[PDB]
Each structure stands twice: as C-alpha cells, then as structure tokens.
Symmetry: C3
Subunit: 280 residues, 3 copies
Amino acid sequence: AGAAPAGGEVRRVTMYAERLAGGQMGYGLEKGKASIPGPLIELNEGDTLHVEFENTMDVPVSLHVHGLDYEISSDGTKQNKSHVEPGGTRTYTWRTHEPGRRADGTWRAGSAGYWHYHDHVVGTEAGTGGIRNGLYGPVIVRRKGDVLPDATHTIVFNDGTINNRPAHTGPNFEATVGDRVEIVMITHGEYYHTFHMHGHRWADNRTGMLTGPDDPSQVIDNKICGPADSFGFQIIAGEGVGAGAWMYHCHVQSHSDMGMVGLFLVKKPDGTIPGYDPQE
Amino acid sequence: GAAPAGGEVRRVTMYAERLAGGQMGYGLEKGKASIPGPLIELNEGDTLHVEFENTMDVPVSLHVHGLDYEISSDGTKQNKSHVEPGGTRTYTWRTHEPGRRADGTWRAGSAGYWHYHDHVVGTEAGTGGIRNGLYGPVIVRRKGDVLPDATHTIVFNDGTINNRPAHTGPNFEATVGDRVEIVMITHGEYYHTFHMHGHRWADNRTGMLTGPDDPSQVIDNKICGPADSFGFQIIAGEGVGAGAWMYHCHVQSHSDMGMVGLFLVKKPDGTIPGY
Amino acid sequence: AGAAPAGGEVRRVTMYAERLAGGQMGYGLEKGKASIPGPLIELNEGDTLHVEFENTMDVPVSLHVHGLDYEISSDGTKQNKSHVEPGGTRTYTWRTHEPGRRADGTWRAGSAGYWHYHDHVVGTEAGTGGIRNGLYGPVIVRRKGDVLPDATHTIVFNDGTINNRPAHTGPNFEATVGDRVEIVMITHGEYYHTFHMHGHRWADNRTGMLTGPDDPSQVIDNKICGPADSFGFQIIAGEGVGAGAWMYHCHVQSHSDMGMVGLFLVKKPDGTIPGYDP
Ligand SMILES: [Cu+2]
Ligand SMILES: [Cu+2]
Ligand SMILES: [Cu+2]
Ligand SMILES: [Cu+2]
Ligand SMILES: [Cu+2]
Ligand SMILES: [Cu+2]
Ligand SMILES: [Cu+2]
Ligand SMILES: [Cu+2]
Ligand SMILES: [Cu+2]
Ligand SMILES: [Cu+2]
Ligand SMILES: [Cu+2]
Ligand SMILES: [Cu+2]
Ligand code: NA
C-alpha cells in the first residue's frame, strides 16, 4: 500500500524443480510445494538474489531469467553449461541495478519492470518442453518510490491455456471495490494472443499508470502479446464502474471460444457481487 | 478546431439489423445500418444512453471497449446484459477526465480510440456477430485535442477490410493539406500489420507527438491483433504531394489476397497525379 | 561518444538490383557486390538522397522506402509506374525533414528513426517474391544530437530465416565489452516473431534508450514484431553482465527450435570469450 524502498539487499532463496501430476513440472520454494506459475520473486533495484537451485527431477532443467543482470554462468543454457543435471544443485545469481547517468552522458536504464523466469533446457535447448510443462514464473523489480499494490495476480497465456489449467476453469481472482490490484501478464509458447479486461484499462508503459498529465502513453484495454512477452499494470478495482463479475479473456476469437476466459470478481465492501450467478 | 470540455448527457437510438447475405449491422435509424457501425464521438465527461433495439431473430448485444460502464451494460450473456429478439435495452456509457486521485496517483482519462461490438451472436464471445459485421468505432476526445477535417474507419476483420470483398478497397479521398483522422480496428482470428505509403504517425494516444520531449516511436507500420484499436491524424500529402497513396496489410499473403486500398490525395483542382 | 550533426546535405548514390545464387536477389552499391540484407543507408534529418538505380535483372523491380519523404514517382509501385524495367534505370529521390511547429501550433514529427527499403513489385504487386528472394535493407535517419554507435548490425526476420541464411547458421556478431553496439531489427514476410536478447535490454521508444528519468517507456528484452515492422536500439556490450556468448533468438518456440538463433559474442579486452567453444 506504500512505496517501494531503495534496494541494495542481498537475498537468498531455495528453489526446486519438481514433476507434478499430468506430465507437468513446476518450480517451488519448498520441496513438495511447486506450483504453476512458479513463485513470485519481488526485488527492489539494487538487490542481489542468490537462487540455491535443486533439480529433483530425472531430466536436466535450468533457470533463465529475463530482464535482470546475470553473468554468463547464470545464463541457464546448455550452451554455456549453466543447466542443472538430475538431482544436482546450482547457485544462480541475479543482480539488479538503478538507473543513472553514464560518463558518455547517456541515461542507463534500470532493472525495474515486469519480467519472468523459465526453463531453457527441457525438451529442447530452447526449453520448449519445459515451458509447455509449466516451468515458468514471474519476477517483479521495483524502482524506489513505485506504488505498491494491495494484491498481485499472475496471468500466463501458455499456448492455448491460462496457467496450464484446463479450458473454462479461470483462474478467478477476487478483489473489493477500491483495491489497488496488480496484474503480471506473461505469454509463452507458439501463439500470439491479445489480453482484454472488461471494465478496466491501463497505460501502455513501464508501470501501467500514467506518470502525470504529460505522459503521452496510449491508454488501452487490449494488448497484443507474443511468446516471452511480459508486462504489468495496476488498476483500482471497480473504479468508475463498480462491483460485478468482470471478465478477462484472450480476444483472439477462437481462443476465447476454446476457454481462455476468467473472472475478476469485484465485491462491494459488504462482500456482495451484484448480478453474479455462477451458472451463467 | 479544438475539442471542448465534456459533461453533456446524450441519447441515441441504435438498432441491430440483418443486412444482405448473412451480414449484420448496427444503425442509428431503422434501415440505416452499416458496416462498420456508426461512428460515436464523445468528449471526456460526456454520458451516452444508447436506447437499443434488436430487430433480428437471434439475440445480440452491445459491448464497448475503454469507456466506463456498470456491470449491467457489460453486454454479455454471463451478466444478462444481452438483448432478446425484438427486445429493447438501454446501455449506458460514461466517460471521465484525467485527474489526480486521493492516493496521489494519476487516473487516466477515457480519451482514446475505441470500439463497440457484439458479444453473443454465434458464441458467448460474439464470434459470429463480429464476423457478420457488428462492430463500430468510438472516439473519446480530451479537452484541447486537435479536431480533424474528416475521419475514416478501417477495420481489418479476419481477411477483409470492413467486410468488403477482396480487392475492393475501400478508397478514401482527401485534398492536399486536409487533416485526416484514421481509426484502425482489428477483429477476428488473425494478426495484421497496418501500413501506409507516403505518411507516418507517432505511436502514442493521439498519433501526434506532444512536442520535442515525446520519445514515442514514429512509424508507418504497426502490428495489431483482434480487438486492438488505435488512431492517428495526418496532413494528407504533407511533404510528399498529391497521388494515390496505398494502404494495406503488410502480411504478404493478406496484401496479395486483397487487403489493400487507396488514400486518394487530390490537388486543389481535383486531380490526382499518376492515377 | 559521437553525436549526429544537423543534416541538409544532398547526397547521390548508385544502387543495383542483381541476381544471386539460389534464386535469390539483392541490392548493392557496386555491381557484383549485392548482399542480403542490402547496404545500410544512414542519413541525418534534412538530408536529401538521390538513388541512381539500375536493374540488372530480367524482371521489373522497385525500391520502396518506409518513413522518409518521397513523391508518388518515387513510391516504387506498379500502380504509380515507379518500378524499374529490366535493364532500366531510374532516379529515386528520398527526402527527410526536421521536426518543428506548424503554423497551427501542432508539432510535426521528424523523419528520424529506424526504417527499411524493399521491393514492391517482384512476383506480386506487394513484392512477395522480391522480399522472399532478399530484396530488402536498412535505413537509419538520425536526429541532430543522437548518440552514434561503434558498430551497427542488421538482423532481418524474413519468414522462417534470419537474413535469408540457412537454418541455425547465425549470423554471429562480435563486440568487446563496453562497445556501443547498434541493432536494427526488421521483419518481413508471412509470420509474426518475437525478438529476444540474452543479457541485454533496451527501451521501447524511438532510439531504444531512455531520454532520462521522466521517460516512462517500457524497458524490455523481448518484442513482438510482424511483417514490415522496424525498430532499433543501442546497447553497451556486456554492461553489467560481462563477456560471453550471448544468445539472441526468435522466442516463438518452434522458430528457435528450427534455427532462428544466433550469437552476440562479447569478448574480454584480451579478445577471449569465457566458456565459448569456437
Ligand atoms: Cu531470455
Ligand atoms: Cu489467445
Ligand atoms: Cu471488452
Ligand atoms: Cu469480452
Ligand atoms: Cu526467455
Ligand atoms: Cu493482414
Ligand atoms: Cu510503404
Ligand atoms: Cu471486445
Ligand atoms: Cu506497400
Ligand atoms: Cu520467429
Ligand atoms: Cu533464450
Ligand atoms: Cu513496405
Ligand atoms: Na510508448
């Protein structure tokens, strides 16, 4: 609800790749608690994260991150020998940095943004099978003073599924009118998609919010995305539109018909959702 | 011309009608339905009540992008805001100005290039309705936005422009110096790239740069997918002159198969060099 | 670093379309030196370029440019009769302009940006055969004060290939840690792609670098593009990540599996690449 602090901490987490039911694989922070999508990793600009990574599987797996600073030995590719053999262990190091003026007078961009990590080694040296099986997760890097949300939810279009779930099964998210909700939106696989939210909109820039009246960024409620794109935004749940079962879906028509649909359930402060009949 | 501040309450009648050969269109008067539907233009703060009547024998709905509306004007079967055959229904669209919220952040205004379309014909995503022609443009202006001399709507709907047969345009005319506004909407199954000859715009809300500090990329080509919408303004023939200036989808098989048209920019006498 | 001057020069260049091996076709500034992609053309806003064009092929060809100012007679299309006949010649003229205030108070965008040129006429009236055969290349228009790079490399996604090369053959690019490297990224053909670089990122705006702390442009390392899109950016090779063989690839999974992959080789000051097996 406040603002992101300045970074600079050194953080440590243990991560596991495990098989799940149905031929799927997931990352998790504790043995037996892997999920799809993987756990959310949140860092402030300047932080260093060491991932003590254990592969509990019987096939090689890796961890590759978009956006952040990492040396070649934390690449997560077979090519640079930064994959993890079955039963093996590896320490991955992710660094982040603040923006700032260089000596040549140019502006060096910071790490802040909506990013993601995924496998690069299962199935093919591009991770095609590992990604398909669920080896993916979100990474948020915040800049000093960024508005922090009340809740963050992660939406992944993975080929024809949302979060590797069966068609027509959400996921659904709940909020109360006035909550500041953050959506992390990641795409993977073979297909392009368009992400659409009923009754809400956002700015097409780093944070999803206009910086002020001078920000010329387009305001949208529909965004085309391709494999390994990531973006995020913050909305005020129900702002100007009120409570109800607000649909989000891919707007590619056949994807919508296949079941790439979910609900943003926005409740009144008394817990009620007007008009909501879940048999409809 | 500059857009004024909004705040007016407006009313319109809208109808859904069957058209020739399987098509469906929206109209503001009975018998006047078109594809694309009629252009709805609002200034931030305006409120629009759409008194809607379904004259067809199947259910139909009206759902809008970008604008403020309560759940009862969602236009989805899921929330029971569709319209039965022969039935009527008032949809209410609101708009708002930008402004600082109490928490200190900036609330985006409604201004932008938007669209409305059906959400229940064929499927509960409106696949059949959109295919048949139930879509149209919506422009919300901010106080002080530059107003054009004309506005043209280009809809890439699957493999057609505005549901027209291949190789039939549409073509639009202007005169050298005209301030021409383009609304560009995409629907259906396919991604597209929209491409203009002789002209370019900025990839931001209005299609024009705000000034020398605007870092937005200036482009003559834009990828777009189903339900994307954007717009821009150009001075017809600026720095390039009169002529028949192609626009087309730049996916090669789409241009070859007929997603092509002309922007006919005339000299003041009415002639178009080379055409 | 270097900075771009103001423009306003009138330049003249000769350009040829020639046949190459394997049914391919390319542009070149000297007979017998056509290449795919075609030669890089760099202008400063305000420059005028006259292209004295010669078609050495047996089919009509044309030169169509994006983003720049040109009259209908340099449009490069059959419908405007601005193609070039077999063995014919034609002068194409491209102009550019600075940004400025129109008399009505609105701001006129400048010509600066990452653009490209290509055929519009070989095979179909959209140039489908010409583009597939290799008739395409980069144009960079710079604005006064834009920072200049140490090196510019052009990557073109054309259908399922990079730069019409066979699958998995790169191209690979070399730099030394700290080099200011400029990438021009053009897409052509039938398919959408996503372009991804390992270890590096850029700003999604005109130059690929933030203007400063007020610039809200998304910073990205992955970008969707479709036929005839062009963008570009500059990076500092290895900045914050070090030397290594840094993969770039289309991130559409089947495309990377089929060979839309290449290497950005960032060398230590002593010319070696840690962990890289030549
Ligand atoms: Cu990556
Ligand atoms: Cu989709
Ligand atoms: Cu919608
Ligand atoms: Cu919808
Ligand atoms: Cu990746
Ligand atoms: Cu198309
Ligand atoms: Cu063009
Ligand atoms: Cu929609
Ligand atoms: Cu063209
Ligand atoms: Cu690709
Ligand atoms: Cu990769
Ligand atoms: Cu083109
Ligand atoms: Na932008």
